[PDB]
mmCIF file of N, CA and C and ligand atoms in Angstrom:
data_model
loop_
_atom_site.group_PDB
_atom_site.id
_atom_site.type_symbol
_atom_site.label_atom_id
_atom_site.label_comp_id
_atom_site.label_asym_id
_atom_site.label_seq_id
_atom_site.Cartn_x
_atom_site.Cartn_y
_atom_site.Cartn_z
ATOM 1 N N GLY A 1 11.186 -5.666 11.111
ATOM 2 C CA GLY A 1 11.959 -6.763 10.977
ATOM 3 C C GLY A 1 11.252 -8.289 11.212
ATOM 4 N N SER A 2 9.885 -8.036 11.565
ATOM 5 C CA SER A 2 8.946 -9.342 11.544
ATOM 6 C C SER A 2 8.566 -9.724 10.330
ATOM 7 N N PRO A 3 8.241 -10.921 10.436
ATOM 8 C CA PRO A 3 7.938 -11.737 9.103
ATOM 9 C C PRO A 3 6.931 -11.028 8.015
ATOM 10 N N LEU A 4 6.061 -10.231 8.558
ATOM 11 C CA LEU A 4 4.919 -9.355 7.956
ATOM 12 C C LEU A 4 5.454 -8.257 7.239
ATOM 13 N N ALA A 5 6.192 -7.546 8.053
ATOM 14 C CA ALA A 5 6.976 -6.322 7.603
ATOM 15 C C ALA A 5 7.921 -6.862 6.406
ATOM 16 N N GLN A 6 8.758 -8.018 6.626
ATOM 17 C CA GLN A 6 9.518 -8.505 5.584
ATOM 18 C C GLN A 6 8.923 -8.913 4.299
ATOM 19 N N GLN A 7 7.676 -9.585 4.388
ATOM 20 C CA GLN A 7 6.789 -9.891 3.196
ATOM 21 C C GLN A 7 6.299 -8.437 2.538
ATOM 22 N N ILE A 8 5.958 -7.343 3.341
ATOM 23 C CA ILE A 8 5.675 -6.253 2.667
ATOM 24 C C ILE A 8 6.748 -5.743 1.906
ATOM 25 N N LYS A 9 8.080 -5.612 2.398
ATOM 26 C CA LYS A 9 9.113 -5.292 1.805
ATOM 27 C C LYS A 9 9.270 -5.924 0.505
ATOM 28 N N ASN A 10 9.244 -7.346 0.651
ATOM 29 C CA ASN A 10 9.380 -8.152 -0.479
ATOM 30 C C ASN A 10 8.575 -7.669 -1.720
ATOM 31 N N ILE A 11 7.409 -7.484 -1.392
ATOM 32 C CA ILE A 11 6.348 -7.218 -2.392
ATOM 33 C C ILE A 11 6.494 -5.986 -2.847
ATOM 34 N N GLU A 12 7.054 -4.886 -2.228
ATOM 35 C CA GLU A 12 7.253 -3.632 -2.774
ATOM 36 C C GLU A 12 8.258 -3.707 -3.785
ATOM 37 N N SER A 13 9.330 -4.423 -3.461
ATOM 38 C CA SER A 13 10.578 -4.756 -4.383
ATOM 39 C C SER A 13 10.177 -5.314 -5.670
ATOM 40 N N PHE A 14 9.122 -6.281 -5.612
ATOM 41 C CA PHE A 14 8.710 -6.921 -6.629
ATOM 42 C C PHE A 14 8.001 -5.946 -7.486
ATOM 43 N N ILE A 15 6.810 -5.198 -6.908
ATOM 44 C CA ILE A 15 6.122 -4.161 -7.788
ATOM 45 C C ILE A 15 6.948 -3.012 -8.596
ATOM 46 N N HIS A 16 7.958 -2.648 -7.708
ATOM 47 C CA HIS A 16 8.800 -1.711 -8.377
ATOM 48 C C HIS A 16 9.498 -2.256 -9.645
ATOM 49 N N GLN A 17 10.181 -3.275 -9.354
ATOM 50 C CA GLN A 17 10.778 -4.136 -10.333
ATOM 51 C C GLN A 17 10.046 -4.431 -11.501
ATOM 52 N N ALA A 18 8.624 -4.909 -11.383
ATOM 53 C CA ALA A 18 7.841 -5.180 -12.392
ATOM 54 C C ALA A 18 7.381 -3.962 -13.141
ATOM 55 N N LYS A 19 7.518 -2.614 -12.661
ATOM 56 C CA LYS A 19 7.281 -1.462 -13.388
ATOM 57 C C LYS A 19 8.440 -0.846 -13.926
ATOM 58 N N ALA A 20 9.481 -1.310 -14.106
ATOM 59 C CA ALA A 20 10.792 -0.914 -14.494
ATOM 60 C C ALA A 20 10.580 -0.914 -16.079
ATOM 61 N N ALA A 21 11.643 -0.245 -16.798
ATOM 62 C CA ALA A 21 11.543 -0.268 -18.070
ATOM 63 C C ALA A 21 11.317 -1.766 -18.938
ATOM 64 N N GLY A 22 10.498 -1.736 -19.791
ATOM 65 C CA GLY A 22 10.366 -2.995 -20.656
ATOM 66 C C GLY A 22 9.478 -4.024 -20.113
ATOM 67 N N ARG A 23 8.743 -3.686 -18.904
ATOM 68 C CA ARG A 23 8.076 -4.619 -18.095
ATOM 69 C C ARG A 23 6.631 -4.336 -18.025
ATOM 70 N N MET A 24 5.969 -4.150 -16.863
ATOM 71 C CA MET A 24 4.558 -3.936 -16.818
ATOM 72 C C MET A 24 4.279 -2.409 -16.410
ATOM 73 N N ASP A 25 2.990 -2.387 -16.827
ATOM 74 C CA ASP A 25 2.112 -1.102 -16.072
ATOM 75 C C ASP A 25 1.227 -1.372 -15.054
ATOM 76 N N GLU A 26 0.932 -2.796 -15.060
ATOM 77 C CA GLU A 26 0.042 -3.263 -14.123
ATOM 78 C C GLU A 26 0.492 -4.465 -13.127
ATOM 79 N N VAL A 27 0.174 -4.578 -12.055
ATOM 80 C CA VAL A 27 0.939 -5.682 -11.138
ATOM 81 C C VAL A 27 -0.282 -5.963 -10.268
ATOM 82 N N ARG A 28 -1.467 -6.490 -10.748
ATOM 83 C CA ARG A 28 -2.672 -6.711 -10.039
ATOM 84 C C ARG A 28 -2.599 -7.841 -9.024
ATOM 85 N N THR A 29 -1.822 -8.688 -9.203
ATOM 86 C CA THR A 29 -1.560 -10.050 -8.332
ATOM 87 C C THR A 29 -0.831 -9.447 -7.231
ATOM 88 N N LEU A 30 0.138 -8.672 -7.464
ATOM 89 C CA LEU A 30 1.111 -8.139 -6.356
ATOM 90 C C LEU A 30 0.490 -7.163 -5.497
ATOM 91 N N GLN A 31 -0.320 -6.356 -6.165
ATOM 92 C CA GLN A 31 -1.186 -5.130 -5.548
ATOM 93 C C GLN A 31 -2.256 -5.788 -4.502
ATOM 94 N N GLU A 32 -2.936 -6.924 -5.086
ATOM 95 C CA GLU A 32 -4.035 -7.707 -4.158
ATOM 96 C C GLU A 32 -3.231 -8.301 -3.092
ATOM 97 N N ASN A 33 -2.065 -9.052 -3.234
ATOM 98 C CA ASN A 33 -1.375 -9.446 -2.130
ATOM 99 C C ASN A 33 -0.766 -8.349 -1.149
ATOM 100 N N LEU A 34 -0.401 -7.221 -1.497
ATOM 101 C CA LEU A 34 0.101 -6.268 -0.716
ATOM 102 C C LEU A 34 -1.087 -5.681 0.140
ATOM 103 N N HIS A 35 -2.170 -5.415 -0.556
ATOM 104 C CA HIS A 35 -3.300 -4.991 0.275
ATOM 105 C C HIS A 35 -3.533 -5.997 1.291
ATOM 106 N N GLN A 36 -3.638 -7.335 1.123
ATOM 107 C CA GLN A 36 -3.870 -8.393 2.401
ATOM 108 C C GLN A 36 -2.700 -8.076 3.540
ATOM 109 N N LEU A 37 -1.714 -8.016 2.990
ATOM 110 C CA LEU A 37 -0.638 -7.910 3.963
ATOM 111 C C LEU A 37 -0.701 -6.773 4.962
ATOM 112 N N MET A 38 -1.169 -5.495 4.172
ATOM 113 C CA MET A 38 -1.353 -4.068 4.969
ATOM 114 C C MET A 38 -2.181 -4.375 6.041
ATOM 115 N N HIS A 39 -3.338 -5.037 6.002
ATOM 116 C CA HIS A 39 -4.252 -5.286 6.900
ATOM 117 C C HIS A 39 -3.798 -6.349 7.955
ATOM 118 N N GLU A 40 -2.836 -7.198 7.691
ATOM 119 C CA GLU A 40 -2.195 -8.096 8.632
ATOM 120 C C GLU A 40 -1.106 -7.313 9.522
ATOM 121 N N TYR A 41 -0.484 -6.325 9.066
ATOM 122 C CA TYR A 41 0.665 -5.902 9.557
ATOM 123 C C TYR A 41 0.026 -4.402 10.459
ATOM 124 N N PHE A 42 -0.605 -3.609 9.663
ATOM 125 C CA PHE A 42 -1.119 -2.505 10.376
ATOM 126 C C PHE A 42 -2.416 -2.599 11.156
ATOM 127 N N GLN A 43 -2.181 -2.893 12.380
ATOM 128 C CA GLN A 43 -3.372 -3.525 13.225
ATOM 129 C C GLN A 43 -4.210 -2.372 13.940
ATOM 130 N N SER B 1 2.059 12.406 15.174
ATOM 131 C CA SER B 1 1.233 11.123 14.654
ATOM 132 C C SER B 1 2.111 10.048 13.930
ATOM 133 N N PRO B 2 2.065 8.950 14.692
ATOM 134 C CA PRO B 2 2.800 7.968 13.968
ATOM 135 C C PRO B 2 2.625 7.716 12.423
ATOM 136 N N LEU B 3 3.363 7.102 11.676
ATOM 137 C CA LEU B 3 3.288 6.890 10.309
ATOM 138 C C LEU B 3 2.522 5.602 10.459
ATOM 139 N N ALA B 4 2.449 4.953 11.455
ATOM 140 C CA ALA B 4 1.741 3.479 11.416
ATOM 141 C C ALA B 4 0.032 3.884 11.450
ATOM 142 N N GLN B 5 -0.222 4.879 12.260
ATOM 143 C CA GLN B 5 -1.505 5.373 12.507
ATOM 144 C C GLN B 5 -2.054 5.916 11.265
ATOM 145 N N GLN B 6 -1.230 6.944 10.728
ATOM 146 C CA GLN B 6 -1.379 7.388 9.403
ATOM 147 C C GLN B 6 -1.887 6.551 8.288
ATOM 148 N N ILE B 7 -0.964 5.421 8.096
ATOM 149 C CA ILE B 7 -1.344 4.416 7.115
ATOM 150 C C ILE B 7 -2.696 3.742 7.611
ATOM 151 N N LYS B 8 -2.945 3.113 8.753
ATOM 152 C CA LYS B 8 -3.899 2.641 9.221
ATOM 153 C C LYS B 8 -5.285 3.328 8.847
ATOM 154 N N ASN B 9 -5.212 4.864 9.342
ATOM 155 C CA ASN B 9 -6.120 5.684 8.925
ATOM 156 C C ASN B 9 -6.653 5.888 7.524
ATOM 157 N N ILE B 10 -5.475 6.146 6.813
ATOM 158 C CA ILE B 10 -5.881 6.397 5.375
ATOM 159 C C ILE B 10 -6.283 5.086 4.551
ATOM 160 N N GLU B 11 -6.019 3.886 4.983
ATOM 161 C CA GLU B 11 -6.578 2.811 4.534
ATOM 162 C C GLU B 11 -8.189 2.557 4.786
ATOM 163 N N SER B 12 -8.388 3.086 5.939
ATOM 164 C CA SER B 12 -9.948 3.113 6.120
ATOM 165 C C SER B 12 -10.598 4.115 5.229
ATOM 166 N N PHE B 13 -9.990 5.152 4.933
ATOM 167 C CA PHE B 13 -10.561 6.392 4.283
ATOM 168 C C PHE B 13 -10.724 5.835 2.493
ATOM 169 N N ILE B 14 -9.508 5.059 2.142
ATOM 170 C CA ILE B 14 -9.639 4.409 1.049
ATOM 171 C C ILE B 14 -10.882 3.582 0.822
ATOM 172 N N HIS B 15 -10.895 2.588 1.739
ATOM 173 C CA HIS B 15 -12.097 1.763 1.757
ATOM 174 C C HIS B 15 -13.484 2.674 1.521
ATOM 175 N N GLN B 16 -13.753 3.518 2.396
ATOM 176 C CA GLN B 16 -14.888 4.343 2.387
ATOM 177 C C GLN B 16 -15.074 4.976 0.966
ATOM 178 N N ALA B 17 -13.990 5.658 0.557
ATOM 179 C CA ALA B 17 -14.042 6.247 -0.700
ATOM 180 C C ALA B 17 -14.448 5.193 -1.695
ATOM 181 N N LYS B 18 -13.972 4.022 -1.821
ATOM 182 C CA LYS B 18 -14.077 2.998 -2.652
ATOM 183 C C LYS B 18 -15.786 2.539 -2.603
ATOM 184 N N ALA B 19 -16.241 2.568 -1.468
ATOM 185 C CA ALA B 19 -17.439 2.155 -1.167
ATOM 186 C C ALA B 19 -18.526 3.408 -1.816
ATOM 187 N N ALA B 20 -18.058 4.353 -1.799
ATOM 188 C CA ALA B 20 -18.920 5.696 -2.160
ATOM 189 C C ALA B 20 -18.636 5.921 -3.815
ATOM 190 N N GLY B 21 -17.862 4.841 -4.348
ATOM 191 C CA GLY B 21 -17.541 5.122 -5.786
ATOM 192 C C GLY B 21 -16.893 6.579 -6.127
ATOM 193 N N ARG B 22 -16.067 6.908 -5.234
ATOM 194 C CA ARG B 22 -15.455 8.136 -5.287
ATOM 195 C C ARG B 22 -13.984 7.900 -5.891
ATOM 196 N N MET B 23 -13.845 7.577 -7.288
ATOM 197 C CA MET B 23 -12.758 7.085 -7.897
ATOM 198 C C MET B 23 -11.424 8.104 -7.632
ATOM 199 N N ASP B 24 -11.744 9.417 -7.918
ATOM 200 C CA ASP B 24 -10.538 10.344 -7.831
ATOM 201 C C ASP B 24 -9.989 10.448 -6.676
ATOM 202 N N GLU B 25 -10.957 10.337 -5.472
ATOM 203 C CA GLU B 25 -10.590 10.390 -4.191
ATOM 204 C C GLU B 25 -9.746 9.087 -3.762
ATOM 205 N N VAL B 26 -10.178 7.808 -4.122
ATOM 206 C CA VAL B 26 -9.336 6.917 -4.053
ATOM 207 C C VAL B 26 -8.017 6.882 -4.742
ATOM 208 N N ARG B 27 -7.964 7.197 -5.952
ATOM 209 C CA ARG B 27 -6.756 7.395 -6.615
ATOM 210 C C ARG B 27 -5.709 8.220 -5.884
ATOM 211 N N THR B 28 -6.248 9.438 -5.481
ATOM 212 C CA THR B 28 -5.473 10.407 -4.578
ATOM 213 C C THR B 28 -4.965 9.747 -3.064
ATOM 214 N N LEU B 29 -5.827 9.209 -2.435
ATOM 215 C CA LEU B 29 -5.341 8.538 -1.263
ATOM 216 C C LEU B 29 -4.555 7.507 -1.417
ATOM 217 N N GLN B 30 -4.801 6.492 -2.468
ATOM 218 C CA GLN B 30 -3.749 5.369 -2.892
ATOM 219 C C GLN B 30 -2.360 6.052 -3.116
ATOM 220 N N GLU B 31 -2.231 7.096 -3.647
ATOM 221 C CA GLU B 31 -0.943 7.648 -4.079
ATOM 222 C C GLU B 31 -0.290 8.223 -2.569
ATOM 223 N N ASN B 32 -1.128 9.009 -1.929
ATOM 224 C CA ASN B 32 -0.433 9.148 -0.634
ATOM 225 C C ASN B 32 0.118 8.079 0.390
ATOM 226 N N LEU B 33 -1.003 6.935 0.393
ATOM 227 C CA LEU B 33 -0.649 5.903 1.101
ATOM 228 C C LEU B 33 0.513 5.106 0.570
ATOM 229 N N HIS B 34 0.951 5.112 -0.774
ATOM 230 C CA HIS B 34 2.165 4.677 -1.263
ATOM 231 C C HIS B 34 3.381 5.402 -0.665
ATOM 232 N N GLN B 35 3.225 6.718 -0.705
ATOM 233 C CA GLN B 35 4.307 7.523 -0.156
ATOM 234 C C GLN B 35 4.436 7.292 1.322
ATOM 235 N N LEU B 36 3.397 7.030 2.172
ATOM 236 C CA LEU B 36 3.556 6.789 3.663
ATOM 237 C C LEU B 36 4.117 5.391 3.750
ATOM 238 N N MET B 37 3.789 4.560 3.097
ATOM 239 C CA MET B 37 4.668 3.280 3.140
ATOM 240 C C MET B 37 5.963 3.330 3.034
ATOM 241 N N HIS B 38 6.371 4.054 1.990
ATOM 242 C CA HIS B 38 7.899 4.223 1.871
ATOM 243 C C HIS B 38 8.435 5.124 2.932
ATOM 244 N N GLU B 39 7.986 6.117 3.430
ATOM 245 C CA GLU B 39 8.316 6.662 4.667
ATOM 246 C C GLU B 39 8.391 5.886 5.723
ATOM 247 N N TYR B 40 7.489 5.038 5.956
ATOM 248 C CA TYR B 40 7.530 4.127 7.140
ATOM 249 C C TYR B 40 8.596 3.250 7.034
ATOM 250 N N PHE B 41 8.771 2.614 5.952
ATOM 251 C CA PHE B 41 9.778 1.286 6.012
ATOM 252 C C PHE B 41 11.218 1.880 5.517
ATOM 253 N N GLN B 42 11.216 3.161 5.171
ATOM 254 C CA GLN B 42 12.571 3.760 4.829
ATOM 255 C C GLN B 42 13.072 4.516 5.962
ATOM 256 N N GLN B 43 12.231 4.903 7.068
ATOM 257 C CA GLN B 43 12.792 5.577 8.371
ATOM 258 C C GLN B 43 13.981 5.051 8.729
HETATM 259 ZN ZN1 ZN C 1 6.744 1.504 -3.706
HETATM 260 ZN ZN1 ZN C 2 -7.837 -2.348 2.816
#
């Protein structure tokens, strides 16, 4: 429920939706941001 | 073992595999990490 957890959950939703039909195979900006957040939250 | 510890640990291993240019290991570990992330947040 913390803000970092919320931001990770938000990004994950954006990644999955961006990989749905008719959209993308790559989500580089999102993955870069998720990677950064993972290091912030998983201490 | 906590899921949070599993996620922290596997991210270290991903970094190490990347640093060693072990691209198949990176791919495999990243897929496992993605599954773990879902387990953690969906629990
Ligand atoms: Zn996901
Ligand atoms: Zn990392």
